[PDB]
């Protein structure tokens, strides 16, 4: 259940999140070309258990994170 | 929301 | 040059925009199903004149509209 | 970024 995605241009792998799960894509995106969907929750980030985070610790890993992001969802 |  | 558009359960249209220009577009939105399209400019909100605002100036028009959007871009 |  685990993808890897590639950030854009613009910093982004493609996906919007809330309360741990994801819920929306962005088109022509890493996320969009990966095959993440949404309703799912976050398990890990670069191999690191993020479940039970605050959505603001899931982004500093996510924000800080360099070009390759693999995610795990359950 | 923010994008990631 | 004006798209309608109507937020979704989430509370968005369905975009991203940097600089006062659409860049990215969310995958199953309202913005995808009415055409909006990555790199134009953002000229009016709800037909006020948004030219030359800040993105938070611009955020905040949107942030605080009712369901329905609507834009014009050059 | 955020999305609207
Ligand atoms: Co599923
Ligand atoms: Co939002
Ligand atoms: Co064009
Ligand atoms: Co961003």
């Known amino acids: 259940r685990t993808i890897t995605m590639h950030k854009d241009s613009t910093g982004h792998v493609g996906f919007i999140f809330k309360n741990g799960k994801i819920t929306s894509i962005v ?3 890493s996320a969009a070309r990966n095959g993440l969907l949404t309703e799912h929750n976050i398990c890990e980030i670069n191999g690191q258990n993020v479940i039970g985070l605050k959505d603001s610790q899931i982004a500093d890993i996510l ?6 992001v693999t ?4 | 929301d923010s994008v990631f």
Request: aromatic share 0%.
């Open chain 1, 27 to 29: 088109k022509d995106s």
């Open chain 1, 63 to 68: 924000s800080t994170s360099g070009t390759v």
């Open chain 1, 71 to 74: 995610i795990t969802i359950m």
